[PDB]
Design a protein around this ligand. Sequence first.
Ligand SMILES: CSC[C@H]1CN(Cc2c[nH]c3c(N)ncnc23)C[C@@H]1O
Ligand SMILES: CSC[C@H]1CN(Cc2c[nH]c3c(N)ncnc23)C[C@@H]1O
Lengths: 230, 230
Amino acid sequence: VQKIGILGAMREEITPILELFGVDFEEIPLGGNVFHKGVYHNKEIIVAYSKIGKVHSTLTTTSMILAFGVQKVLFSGVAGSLVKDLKINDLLVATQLVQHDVDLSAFDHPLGFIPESAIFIETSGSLNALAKKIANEQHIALKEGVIASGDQFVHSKERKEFLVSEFKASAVEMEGASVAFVCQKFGVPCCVLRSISDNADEKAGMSFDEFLEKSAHTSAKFLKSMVDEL
Amino acid sequence: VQKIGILGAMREEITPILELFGVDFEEIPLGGNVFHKGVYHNKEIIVAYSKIGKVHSTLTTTSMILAFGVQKVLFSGVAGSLVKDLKINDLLVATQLVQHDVDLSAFDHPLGFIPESAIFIETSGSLNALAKKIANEQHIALKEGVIASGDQFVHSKERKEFLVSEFKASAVEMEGASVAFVCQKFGVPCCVLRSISDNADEKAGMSFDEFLEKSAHTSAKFLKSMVDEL
Ligand SMILES: CSC[C@H]1CN(Cc2c[nH]c3c(N)ncnc23)C[C@@H]1O
Ligand SMILES: CSC[C@H]1CN(Cc2c[nH]c3c(N)ncnc23)C[C@@H]1O
């Protein structure tokens, strides 16, 4: 009855999701994505990886909503940490997201702002509160904070400093803001969950390669614990 | 019978389109866009402005296809010129588009490239050939070339030089690549038509403010001449 959309960006982010749910899935191709449709604890779950970045994730989220009719979207994957207290493997949920690479400052718009929109996009307070409740019960740390999304893999101190000073972001990735944006437009509750894979600095490529699979699994496990309480 | 989606990014880009078609439209809100649905020369035309940038335009294009079932998408609006022979008011059609702000070079991917995708996205050769035919018959210049799209308003010589050297782009805007990308994914013919509003340099904000309305109208008139032959 209840339909839940579950998104990662990369195949690596959804492999553990499919395995952890442990049910059979039907594969349904649409718009260049493969949607895995299954039934788990009396809910219909629709799982897909968008492919990397803002256009990919916007498209996939829109398809989930318009073609599959999902009633909530939960994103699970990895991210770069912009703050000392978010270390490799640590989880956070996005309270707000921003498109950090948006620049219409030639017209004196604030960075991140587009006319007829807003700098910050909100996620579901109800889903974030559920995550927090579960994290406390499992004795797991969970941070809440701003996630910055853009179409670059960030791997420099200079870009980190900008994201922190301009947007007070705690983490960086390439999809969350676009997912939450679409959801907002269609009145669909959204939760963006990430596990830290790297520190978004000069060493980030190397850290990401090392920790992608473990961090993806950490995020996937937690997302499943949320779906278990929905 | 035939359904044609018509897109601009800004309200200013579709105002002349609605006026030039000169028919009644029904307004249908969806996903934060207003779709203007009318009948013109025995075709159903669905007109909308996406709002600025790649996420907005991806969403709107996806809605056009999935919710309204359009069989072709024609984009009309303004752009920054990256080449001397494209002057203010001049028209071009995009042969290919690129997301110029995509950077996964930390993993030695070429700029503009995302895994499971491609740097360049093609548009409809058939629609481009129609534009060329019409332009020749009307004795209007029409260039064909690469259009670069990103989420920044480009207003610097340094960024222009990069777009020309890296992608051999002739023009820059913030929506075309995302529109053509979605269309490709759903097998929908796409044509991206632009009229030059500025030179994407330090003076671009000022040129854009001056020429937006005239350049939008130039593009809109031409798009209508295409729809007249479809
Ligand atoms: C192969 S591209 C990176 C993929 C992993 N996703 C999140 C991410 C982790 N670290 C990041 C960083 N330093 N900068 C931006 N994004 C991220 C984004 C994209 O799907
Ligand atoms: C208010 S933002 C600019 C709007 C006009 N569209 C095209 C465009 C013209 N000149 C451009 C330039 N120098 N750099 C990028 N884009 C453009 C993009 C956006 O909708």
